[PDB]
Amino acid sequence: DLGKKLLEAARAGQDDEVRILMANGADVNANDEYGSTPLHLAALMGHLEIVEVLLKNGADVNAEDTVGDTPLHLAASLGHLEIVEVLLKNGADVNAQDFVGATPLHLAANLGHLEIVEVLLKHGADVNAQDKFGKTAFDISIDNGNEDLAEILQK
Amino acid sequence: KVFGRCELAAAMKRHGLDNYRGYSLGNWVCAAKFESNFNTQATNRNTDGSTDYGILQINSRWWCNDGRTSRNLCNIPCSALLSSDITASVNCAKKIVSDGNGMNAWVAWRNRCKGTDVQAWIRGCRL
Ligand SMILES: [Cl-]
């Protein structure tokens, strides 16, 4: 019954309790009500150190929740630059699309995270990708009237 | 209709969601994003026969009447939660959170917004 307790520890940033649950054979890929893995919740709440520990212990870097979001989706949208690079260097799909067709580039662009958009572009983010509504990251920046982001995406 | 983030923030502000019970506006924009991806047309049938309608995915077992589910606590047909005007969904949403348990009734907010910087969802919008 340890998987439920590792999920709580990952979201809560309990760096020490994550280690103890890991050594005692807790499932590093447990799912909660929303289909989140511990790596999902650690990226969502910006816990960089717990993210690395979960990766060392074999967490699925591209696990999808009930809506098809990967941990890189959540880290890119919340603006956690440190976590985005750790996820990329460990084999995260930079062009993963969830159930509504959104990529990490879409989610970072929607919240105006310039530095994260530039890192994603460097790692081969597809600027022509569209969600199910036909929108690119450029379209999103125009809808939100973000001129600085538009310039980034225009080159 | 699919809202833009800032467009929906401005519309939610007009409908009384930046001054409601301490639930700051960013909470609502974040919740609509993970409920419906800003799509007022979103409809998802639940495993129990009920259906979630609209931009805040209001459930048809308890809060509206769809003729194929009889509580209708928002006194509204579920079809009325699907128009490009968000008045119906907002007024019904205000009734859902005001029972006492609050925003924790919002599954998408609880799993994806609660504990994050919700003010980011209105960041960069000229309101
Ligand atoms: Cl009030």
Ordered DSSP codes for B35-91: HHTTBTT-EEE-TTS-EEETTTTEETTTS-B-S-----TT-SBGGGGGSS--HHHHH
Candidates A67, A131, A136, A138, partner chain B, best to mutate (most B CBs within 10 A): A67
Neighbours of A58 (CB within 10 A): 9
Q: Give the pairing type, strands B51-53 and B58-59.
A: antiparallel
Looking at the DSSP bridge assignments, the partners of residue B59 are: B52
Pick the closest to residue A92 from A60, A117, A122 (CA basis). A60
Known binding residues of B: 99
Domain residue spans of chain A:
1-155
| DSSP conformational letter for B124 | T
Contact between residue A38 and residue A28 where contact means Cβ atoms under 8 Å apart: yes
Q: Which residues of B79-99 are buried (b: 16+ CB within 10 A; e: fewer)?
A: ebbbeeebebbbebbbebbee
Q: Among residues 67-126 of chain B, which lie with CB inside 8 Å of chain A?
A: 107, 111-112, 115-117, 120-121, 123-126
Query: Measuring CA to CA, how many Å separate A99 from each of A64, A67, B102?
Result: 10, 6, 28
List all residues 6 or more positions away from A145 whose beta carbon is below 8 Å from its beta carbon: B6, B124, B126
Two tokens, residue A43: 């990226």
Secondary structure of residue B104 in the 3-state scheme: helix
Within 8 A of B120 by CB-CB distance, chain A residues are 78-79, 111
Candidate list B48, B52, B66, B85, residue with the active-site label: B52
The dihedrals phi and psi of B61, each to the nearest 5 degrees, come to: -70, -35
Q: Which fold has domain A1-155?
A: 1.25.40
Contact between residue A53 and residue A22 where contact means Cβ atoms under 8 Å apart: yes
Two tokens, residue B76: 């509204």
Pick the closest to residue A141 from B33, B36, B4 (CA basis). B4
d(CA A113, CA A140): 12
CA distance B36 to chain A (A): 10
Position B96, amino acid: I
Q: Which residues of A89-116 are buried (b: 16+ CB within 10 A; e: fewer)?
A: ebebebebbbebbbbbbbbbbbbbbbeb
Q: Give the pairing type, strands B43-45 and B58-59.
A: unpaired
d(CA A145, CA A141): 6
d(CA A78, CA A111): 8
Secondary structure of residue B2 in the 3-state scheme: strand
For chain A, the 3-state helix, strand and coil shares in percent, each to the nearest 5, are 50, 0, 50
Two tokens, residue A46: 């910006």
| DSSP conformational letter for B3 | -
Crossing angle of the two packed helices A114-122 and A81-89, in degrees rounded to 10: 10
CATH of the domain at B8: 1.10.530.10
Candidates B34, B112, B117, B122, partner chain A, best to mutate (most A CBs within 10 A): B112
Query: Measuring CA to CA, how many Å separate B107 from each of A22, B29, B31, B111?
Result: 28, 14, 9, 6
Please count the CA atoms within 13 angstroms of the CA of A145 that sit on its side-chain side.
Answer: 8
Please count the CA atoms within 13 angstroms of the CA of A112 that sit on its side-chain side.
Answer: 16
| DSSP conformational letter for A12 | T
Pick the closest to residue A110 from A82, A84, A72, A139 (CA basis). A139
By CB atoms closer than 10 A (0-12, 13-18, 19+), residue A42 is: buried
Two tokens, residue A144: 């939100």
CA distance B111 to chain A (A): 7
Query: Measuring CA to CA, how many Å separate A7 from each of A10, A22, A149, B80?
Result: 5, 11, 35, 38
Q: Give the pairing type, strands B43-45 and B51-53.
A: antiparallel
Residue among B111, B115, B124 whose CB faces A144 most closely: B124
Task: Compute and round to an integer the Cα radius of gyration of chain B.
Answer: 14
Q: Which ranges in A15-103 belong to alpha helices (H)?
A: 15-23, 38-44, 48-56, 71-78, 81-89
User: What Å resolution does this PDB entry report?
Assistant: 2.3
d(CA A116, CA B79): 39
Q: Is B7 a catalytic residue?
A: no
Instruction: Please give the biggest Cα pair distance in chain B.
Output: 42
For chain B, the 3-state helix, strand and coil shares in percent, each to the nearest 5, are 40, 10, 50
Q: Among residues 12-51 of chain B, which lie with CB inside 8 Å of chain A?
A: 34, 37, 39
Candidate list B35, B48, B66, B117, residue with the active-site label: B35
CB-CB under 8 Å, A133 with B7: no
Q: How many domains does chain B have?
A: 1
Q: How far apart are the first and last CA of chain A?
A: 50
Position B85, amino acid: D
Looking at the DSSP bridge assignments, the partners of residue B2 are: B39
CA distance B118 to chain A (A): 10
d(CA A51, CA A10): 8
Two tokens, residue B109: 């907010």
